[PDB]
Write a protein that binds this ligand. Structure first.
Ligand SMILES: CN(CCO)S(=O)(=O)c1ccc(N)cc1
Ligand SMILES: CN(CCO)S(=O)(=O)c1ccc(N)cc1
Ligand SMILES: CN(CCO)S(=O)(=O)c1ccc(N)cc1
Lengths: 348, 348, 348, 348, 348
């Protein structure tokens, strides 16, 4: 017996939709949901989605509040819809998937993921919910996550981190590292060897290796010497070049974090979504050096060093493909006289 | 157990709110309420009120679908709020009253009209509903309607006509003529002797007396002769003068109806609401004669003739007060040499 | 090379989208599309849909401007989406279908109806367009219309009338009568033997048989005598009973049309969409007789007479199923002592 | 001392802005202006313009309520802005001009038309207002209207009709025929010899000559015989051809009016504005004959007959330029063997 | 002579409404008020309220700019409306009270608090304004604040802190500690013994006692030992337990502040309003420990220690009622073997 007033009752009393009975008075004005509290309207939700205000409110109330894969991973794995949950995309303030299965009457395409309407879609299944591993076994297309082993199915160990209510974290009190499984047209796929992005923030960046601790503490020249990175263009690629009007390199989040402690800068996130590679229009406040499209990836510095050291440096320009977050990322490698000139996630 | 989905269910299945159980999918987008029918959104309601879309939808669904007094009568009697019903104002596409009593959680000031919050307000009671005559007896301020006598209470016979779902009519299959009662500060008040407006439309005007039949059929000079109206300025007041740039007279709806059959004209209803006297910005299409504020009243021609013939015609200008629809309507009477020059509902 | 400015250019210069090249200045403000003409904004489109303003504008510009089946027929046949066209629903001022195939980048689920995404959906195909009959042969689910025979496919002759730019008409200069075909799960289905609604308006109703001419011209008692309709409750069912507060019968559009010439009435279309059976909240202006849900069907009077005369009148109450516009319409037949009491399209 | 509350006070008490002092409570919600009357909000204005709601309300309140030139004439004369008035465009429910001179603080580019900002703009002056003829003499660019002669200035007699509060009419109680004057770059320009459109409606069309009376009353073949119109394609051009899927001709409003009495049709006004030539997407309800862009002009039939009879009929195709409403209207004349095939206002 | 333009003039020139004369050009677009400055629109106000944009703008301009009681106190005391002022609720960006008395024509229910309409409402009076103490003496229901003594009335010393333009502070240059008085149905009430919340922020929390200084500086075990808090579950209740998926305890703002210096966390304020007890959906970033509804109260640690040490610890579960900010707060006390297990502000 779903209703706007009941969804509102649950939000007010439980912090989210929890299947409780009850109603609270609600008013909708433009794209905002209010509730009456002692005779005054209190805002419960502001719709930032392209869905109707009351439909978006319900999907937000019915969001998954357990640690879930980051939307970038789900997208990279080709997920179209989730089974009996809503993956809320906090970077977009909107549902990660357009349609639902057994969640909301307005967005439901089916009540159960076994309906023939779901057959052409990659359905996301959560092995932590009863019967979901079996639903994955019967579905033609799907992605499954589990905390433990699945008999007969060989796993792909996912990232250490997961999103819990919009907070990306490596769980200590909860499990955030999942086993990933995928099926295309009934066949259990073999997921590829992959690197993972670290999902760190510029403001609260923390090193996750001795190489990363040395990058943030040592001076540019001490570091490049210590890790035998001469001829690998880390001065340009990682540290960044701010001497010309166009900002040079600066494609790794750790290099942006090192710069951030000294001089601030503006990052215009012109396509605000979760993605393996992010594009920013950067303006350096100290120098005035800027770049319209600066691609940034948060790889562990050790992983980036491994990737750049595993390339043939004898060709002027070439595309280097790297599996990161299960997807194929194309990089542009530019070399001269056997040394790197630049290496960046290809803008295509 | 009120809900948006339940109100929508009742509208779809019952044509209005009928206390039935059930829910239908609803989407709200801007000021419109839609419901999903075979996968497509079908509009159920467009909010034209100053209330939130879902609140206005509920009050419209909970509107009184029995013949009820016209909003002009309720306003003239000082009604602030209705008891356990919504009087819908079809001329404004909005509730006739701001707040409610036992109707909607968002607009309710009380569940029962006996709450101390209601004491200062003139509450409208409907004697056709059980216990409402008693609630009027216990209310400090109120207006009561009934189909018959209430022991000890001196009645006031109201208009022949009532509004049934926005259609003003004199009932043949339903009763539309009510007894009216009013109380101010605990004391039953004697309602004045009053005339009533006829509530006719310009497009579908019908005569309701032999004098009105003679006005519409006979020529101007022979009607004035037949009814001894020489010196009463009916040529100006009722027929209208279109020879000058400013349109002369034309203050009785019957005169506008007679003109309408011959030449069309524009009536700009610049304050669109139900009222005993209406003001229009009129432009005559045939002549180009116009008036920014032309006050119009729909009195039965016999009643207007009686009012104008009961005036002392020896003073240049004076205010003539007439009780119409229970309210005092101030007219401006202008005379010269014992004859009427003009008589119009005085523009306040 | 689709654009808002290009769609606007075509609307301004061609009256609709016609694949022409060019751009005109456009401004979007709230739900309205304007274009600059001699320095002033001229409204081109007001969005009444639940789609974004620019998306709805494009689908409306790309509407089918040839005679097409009425949305009620397409709905009754289970149509989900159209192939490479937009069926515009003029009764809802919105696209008849949510998604598109090869029409608009925002609403397209596929470019060609052969994509696996379309397989579960009943796709509408138009045999008047090259290659569409073959696409129907290869589609898993679909409805096809043609002007003539398709080799091997057993036809169903559809209604005489079709919708041309929102005008329902029986074509004289264009063909409006189509052959209909349907497929479910790869199998051509035999469409049932069916009656068709006449799609007439109350305001401009025209008789289409001598029985209908006799109904509108003759008095009630002599029409019933002439057509041997004694004991068939036409006085209640077709003519309508306005003597009580609840309006009796009045379920055939011809009966509403006969009443309309004499006395006006309000029809509140509370679910405004195209459907075989329509529900109205009716209020009779002359009597004040009303009904919250009055189901109305526009059958040719001869067809209704045939249906009611083909029923067993020996049971108190029973459901009578009739195929109209390819759908099963459930009627409620009430009898007493071998005579009809009432017969109405059963309110579901 | 301009204010929203003061503009609202004037609208409520005077029917428009009349420079009166006073304030009324106002509420603005979305694009609508309301005022409180006996505790309920009454709508005063709904913004249909691309200007802010309160700005549009003020310009509408300050509209010219005297007979003024039709917007099509002002546009054809190149008018950009009006001096100390607002010409309200009733066909667009918006101001005819973007900016103002001495009217509203939000839209004013100047307080007086003599400011240097106005010099490049063609300013409209009204000789009926004191000092406006002199302001035209001192303005670099402008259009002037007067009721009589202006010493030394060679006049142009304009149309018989003018717009009074949105009603186009030939004045009997007011003057609607003006003398027209124009200046470009300080130089008074000679306005061309011109025909005028009649500005009639399809629904209330009235003949304005014996030829027009004969067109509406006589049958096609006898009207063509009586007025020696053999070989002039009036059967196609004026009467219209509804035998094929594409509607033939039908370019004169009188021909559309003759057709309208017999069979109804839909005219989709896809560019809703005032113009000498109008374009409609027409669908004939009786036949199903239609045309995406059907250009229509309301010329007096005598004037159209004069234009078509003054053409050389010896060339296959050619552009015929005719001055109508002061603008050059390009027609397309198609001939074969010395007889007209078609003649239509050329679609630009 | 109130107006939108005048309110805007005052905001621009005085920072708020100050009764000055003058007007500035204003434009309203959707929910925003702009003013023209050198030909460009500058935003003055964005409506976040459920009132019309211009009405909300006026009440915000007319807000009380002196230190005033926090809305939580006024709510706890049952205040319905303020006398001749607007208490602006900065936590909701809306007026604290729906209606006004002598402030704005759109929201005024009366001009003076002595009107009979105000009789059933608890009116807030400010003894710092002339005549307000006397108005409290004559009002049936009310709450009065003063800086000094009121003859005959015994006072209730309120919190040290007050809100000055949305900044909660203990005044050094202004007086923020008021004497509170209340009247119900004409009778001067005796306000109860109460604790007060401290109204501190998590980001800028400052200790206000030696116990609070010791809590923030010492380690958990040193503190619990020093203040003899063994068996009082401060490890769970105040410090917080982050070892399990559900976050344990953490109900006092000081404990959240201590945690905040070490590890960040997300507090989803799902009912954003001023209240004695606040509810947050908390997610701990370091551990991933979370709780949908975590009730938080900012009591001085000494006050919380006093409350928990004054309870009978012999019952498994019981409701403990504590007067905080004049209202009764129910806590849930859970004990086992004479020791506290948990104590939290009861979620009811
Ligand atoms: C409860 N209030 C005061 C009534 O004593 S009110 O909410 O402000 C209000 C309610 C109804 C009307 N008609 C007007 C104001
Ligand atoms: C692609 N999708 C599922 C279809 O297999 S959909 O986008 O959610 C959708 C498309 C069209 C209709 N009619 C309904 C749903
Ligand atoms: C002042 N400006 C330029 C005029 O010289 S303007 O504001 O941009 C403008 C004013 C009026 C019209 N019709 C067009 C543009």
């Amino acid at each position: 017996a779903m209703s706007l007033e009941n969804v509102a009752f649950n939000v007010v009393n439980k912090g989210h939709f929890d299947g409780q009975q009850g109603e609270v008075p609600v008013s909708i004005i433009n794209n905002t949901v209010y509730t009456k509290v002692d005779g005054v309207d209190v805002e419960l939700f502001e719709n930032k989605t392209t869905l109707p205000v009351n439909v978006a409110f319900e999907l937000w109330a019915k969001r998954n509040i357990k640690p879930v894969p980051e939307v970038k991973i789900l997208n990279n794995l080709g997920v179209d819809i989730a089974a009996n949950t809503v993956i809320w995309d906090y970077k977009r303030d909107a549902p990660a998937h357009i349609s639902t299965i057994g969640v909301c009457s307005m967005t439901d395409i089916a009540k159960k993921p076994t309906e023939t309407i779901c057959a052409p879609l990659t359905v996301f299944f959560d092995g932590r919910v009863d019967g979901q591993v079996d639903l994955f076994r019967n579905a033609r297309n799907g992605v499954l996550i589990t905390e433990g082993s699945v008999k007969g199915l060989q796993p792909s160990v996912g990232p250490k981190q997961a999103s819990l209510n919009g907070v990306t974290l490596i769980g200590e009190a909860v499990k955030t590292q999942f086993n990933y499984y995928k099926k295309v047209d009934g066949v259990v796929q073999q997921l590829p060897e992959t690197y993972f992005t670290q999902s760190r923030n510029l403001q609260e960046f923390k090193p996750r290796s001795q190489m990363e601790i040395d990058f943030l503490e040592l001076a540019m020249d001490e570091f490049i010497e210590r890790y035998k990175l001469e001829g690998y263009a880390f001065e340009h690629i990682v540290y960044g070049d701010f001497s010309h009007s166009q900002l040079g390199g600066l494609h790794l989040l750790i290099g942006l974090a090192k710069r951030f402690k000294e001089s601030p800068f503006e990052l215009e996130d012109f396509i605000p979504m979760d993605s393996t590679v992010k594009n920013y229009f950067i303006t350096d406040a100290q120098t005035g050096s800027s770049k319209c499209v600066c691609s940034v990836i948060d790889l562990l510095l050790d992983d980036f060093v491994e990737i750049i050291k595993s390339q043939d440096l004898s060709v002027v320009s070439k595309v280097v493909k790297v599996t990161i977050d299960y997807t194929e990322i194309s990089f542009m490698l530019w070399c001269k006289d056997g040394h790197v000139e630049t290496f960046y996630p290809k803008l295509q």
